[PDB]
Amino acid sequence: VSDYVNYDIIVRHYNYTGKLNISADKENSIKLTSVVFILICCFIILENIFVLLTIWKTKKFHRPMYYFIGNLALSDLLAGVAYTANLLLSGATTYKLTPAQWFLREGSMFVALSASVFSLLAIAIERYITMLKNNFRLFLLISACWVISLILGGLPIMGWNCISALSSCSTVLPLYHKHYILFCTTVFTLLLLSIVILYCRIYSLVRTRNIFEMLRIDEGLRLKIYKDTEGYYTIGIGHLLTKSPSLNAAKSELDKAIGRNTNGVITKDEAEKLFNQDVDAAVRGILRNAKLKPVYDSLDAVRRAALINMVFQMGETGVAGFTNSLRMLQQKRWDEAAVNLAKSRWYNQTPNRAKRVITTFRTGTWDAYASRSSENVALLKTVIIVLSVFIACWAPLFILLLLDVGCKVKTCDILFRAEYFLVLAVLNSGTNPIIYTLTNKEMRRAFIRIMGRPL
Numbered sequence: 362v363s364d365y366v367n368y369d370i371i372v373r374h375y376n377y378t379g380k381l382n383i384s385a386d387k388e389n390s391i392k393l394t395s396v397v398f399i400l401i402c403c404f405i406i407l408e409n410i411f412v413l414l415t416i417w418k419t420k421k422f423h424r425p426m427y428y429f430i431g432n433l434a435l436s437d438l439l440a441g442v443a444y445t446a447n448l449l450l451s452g453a454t455t456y457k458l459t460p461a462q463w464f465l466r467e468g469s470m471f472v473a474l475s476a477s478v479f480s481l482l483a484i485a486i487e488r489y490i491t492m493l494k495n496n497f498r499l500f501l502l503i504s505a506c507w508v509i510s511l512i513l514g515g516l517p518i519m520g521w522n523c524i525s526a527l528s529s530c531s532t533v534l535p536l537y538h539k540h541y542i543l544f545c546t547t548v549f550t551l552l553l554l555s556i557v558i559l560y561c562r563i564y565s566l567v568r569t570r571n572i573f574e575m576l577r578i579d580e581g582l583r584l585k586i587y588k589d590t591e592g593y594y595t596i597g598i599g600h601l602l603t604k605s606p607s608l609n610a611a612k613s614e615l616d617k618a619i620g621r622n623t624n625g626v627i628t629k630d631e632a633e634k635l636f637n638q639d640v641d642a643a644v645r646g647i648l649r650n651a652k653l654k655p656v657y658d659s660l661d662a663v664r665r666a667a668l669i670n671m672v673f674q675m676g677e678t679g680v681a682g683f684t685n686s687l688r689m690l691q692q693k694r695w696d697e698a699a700v701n702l703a704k705s706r707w708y709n710q711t712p713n714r715a716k717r718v719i720t721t722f723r724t725g726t727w728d729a730y731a732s733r734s735s736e737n738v739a740l741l742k743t744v745i746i747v748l749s750v751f752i753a754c755w756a757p758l759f760i761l762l763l764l765d766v767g768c769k770v771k772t773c774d775i776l777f778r779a780e781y782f783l784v785l786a787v788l789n790s791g792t793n794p795i796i797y798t799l800t801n802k803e804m805r806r807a808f809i810r811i812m813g814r815p816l
């Protein structure tokens with residue numbers, strides 16, 4: 362009987378879980394494991410310092426997303442520091458710690474995890490705000506992100522432990538209460554599930570926003586009925602109301618399409634809902650032709666919309682009337698199809714519009730329409746892979762932890778030799794700096810642009 366700062370508690374906790382007598386196993390190999398993982402940690406420290414340095418040095422990297430990337434780099438930086446301190450205070454030294462020195466040891470790993478989860482979320486929501494639209498509110502969120510992490514990470518210290526309740530002690534973390542691990546595992550899988558559903562929504566809405574903004578320039582937009590260059594009444598994004606030269610006939614067909622009296626003026630949303638009808642019809646027109654559907658299947662989202670834009674102006678037989686171009690498009694030879702369309706009547710009638718459509722087929726990017734909203738495509742695709750790596754590294758531990766909640770003590774063998782799951786989750790701290798320079802050239806260009814020693 363003494364302060365719950367006595368080393369005997371740690372002995373009883375590893376004794377109950379069955380780790381005290383098996384502590385003297387592979388102790389010589391444990392030294393080889395630690396010294397090597399300490400080197401890997403120091404490499405992770407530099408990696409995240411380099412990520413924090415690039416953002417601090419590049420002016421174009423002073424954007425809200427990069428601030429959350431830096432905050433994520435901080436989570437993975439302090440993770441490496443916490444695991445370097447873990448390896449040093451783990452193994453034989455585990456029994457030389459007090460319960461407080463232990464709840465702080467493994468508590469540091471939880472704080473670093475919680476911070477990474479919220480940091481990822483901070484990047485996830487940021488991507489949803491870029492499509493549809495404040496520096497002081499950003500540092501409040503980063504501060505709140507760490508405050509919630511310090512509470513959700515260190516609350517077992519201030520009460521929620523299992524010191525006198527061995528029946529509720531998890532075997533992979535002896536001094537942690539089984540319910541607390543279940544609470545962390547469920548909160549973090551629920552938060553990681555929120556990211557995945559959000560990114561599926563972001564990638565789908567941007568796909569529909571890219572085809573909208575593309576035709577928002579080529580055929581413009583209108584709230585009131587206007588006559589086209591051919592000689593027929595039109596509204597919104599090239600929606601041909603009638604071929605008849607009667608203004609009231611256009612009002613008749615318009616009111617049938619919307620379902621209310623407009624007198625000629627329609628809402629921005631009513632134009633968009635009418636626009637999807639014109640896109641869907643043009644899309645159906647592609648999936649019904651033996652020369653358009655194979656090409657659409659061989660194209661990407663950017664070049665698919667480029668073909669949709671062509672159908673949106675002329676029609677099914679109109680685009681089918683360029684077999685020489687379509688054949689060169691299906692053969693993945695963009696430069697060859699670019700010349701055929703440049704000499705055709707379509708390029709001679711509307712030169713400024715066809716130029717952008719042809720550039721989309723050649724470049725395969727929205728650079729001919731969006732200036733900086735096109736670069737975000739590569740900047741978003743890379744972040745989805747960051748999350749995909751994170752869920753691949755932590756899920757094995759999360760499953761293992763969930764198994765520890767639903768397993769009697771000294772029963773499940775997987776829970777003992779579970780040092781591999783803990784290491785895979787640690788390695789992830791040095792995969793984000795590596796994934797930036799490999800799946801993002803705009804970030805990689807800034808990274809090399811940073812070779813100054815004193816800087």
Ligand SMILES: CCCCCCc1cccc(NC(=O)[C@H](N)CCP(=O)(O)O)c1
Nearest residue numbers: 451452455470471474533534545546783
């Ligand atoms: C809910 C998710 C759990 C948070 C993950 C915290 C974490 C990350 C990485 C490692 C560890 N724990 C360890 O590696 C421990 N040193 C295991 C060995 P021991 O402490 O001796 O049982 C704990």
Ligand SMILES: *[C@@H]1O[C@H](CO)[C@@H](O)[C@H](O)[C@H]1NC(C)=O
Nearest residue numbers: 372373375376377378381382
């Ligand atoms: C605790 O460890 C001691 C040796 O240090 C051993 O004799 C005892 O059986 C263990 N207690 C339980 C409940 O397994």
